[PDB]
Design a protein around this ligand. Sequence first.
Ligand SMILES: [Cl-]
Length: 348
Amino acid sequence: SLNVIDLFSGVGGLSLGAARAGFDVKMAVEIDQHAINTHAINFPRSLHVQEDVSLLNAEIIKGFFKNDMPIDGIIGGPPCQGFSDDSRNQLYMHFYRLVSELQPLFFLAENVPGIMQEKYSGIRNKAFNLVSGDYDILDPIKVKASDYGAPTIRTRYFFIGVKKSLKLDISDEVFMPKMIDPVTVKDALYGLPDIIDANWQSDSESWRTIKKDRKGGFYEKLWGQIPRNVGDTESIAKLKNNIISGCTGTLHSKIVQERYASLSFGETDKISRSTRLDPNGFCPTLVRPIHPYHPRVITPREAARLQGFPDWFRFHVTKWHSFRQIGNSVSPIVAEYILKGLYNLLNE
Ligand SMILES: [Cl-]
């Protein structure tokens, strides 16, 4: 048992990566009620703390556990003002304060582009300082998700540190993708219903039968590889009957529909700014993409697939919330790869 806490967890993209890599995600901390409720649905055995990280310290956190829990890793997404304001920069520093106070074997922070700007070099240096005494801090890892077999080209920075006391040697071999087959839009969307319930914002789950008669790495991750103690029981049970949630469409006017039908692959609609997916391409950074074949925006479940979430992962019922939950996540496929490198290091 190597134990992690996920700070700023959202619905648990990075958590699922950790769990699949072999870590036990013991606690998730997330301020947003919808995000953390969704995290609890998918990770019912993790502790859930709906809290501002600024109100936390090492002693408070040990108090939550009550059992002198060894915190082997602190992972998370520290917020940053980025391309946007001030409180996010405070929260950034609290992530690193917590790492310093808790002294885990490692930390992993993920950030979107915006973090490397000159105007943040002060707070990044201040954060490096809190940890550089006790940690071997790796240079930034900038990854493109599609290189790890996720169907999207979104880029992400990972910042990793490992306790000096461990005296580990870290080559990039461990984090680099090897033996990875690319997953295009067409492959990720295979077997989903062609006819879906197109509504406005309905309050009920859109459970639908899919075809699951495919083979290969992506599909094993899509329909299985459920870590121990992870997963919504009903979602898992329904998946056994080829039934999954989130297949809910949006009702479009005929004029919109005709405009979308006329889009070529990769074309951005001049009016809505939505872009039609290329079936042999990847999903751009997650306005909603237009389906490659159907004249409509994609469904939450389609977005989930394109982001690298498995079909058994359950999101909020509404399109509004689920699309935000999906867009705000690290791809679980990318997260798993990077975190498995760290797990392997800590088992030598
Ligand atoms: Cl990602």
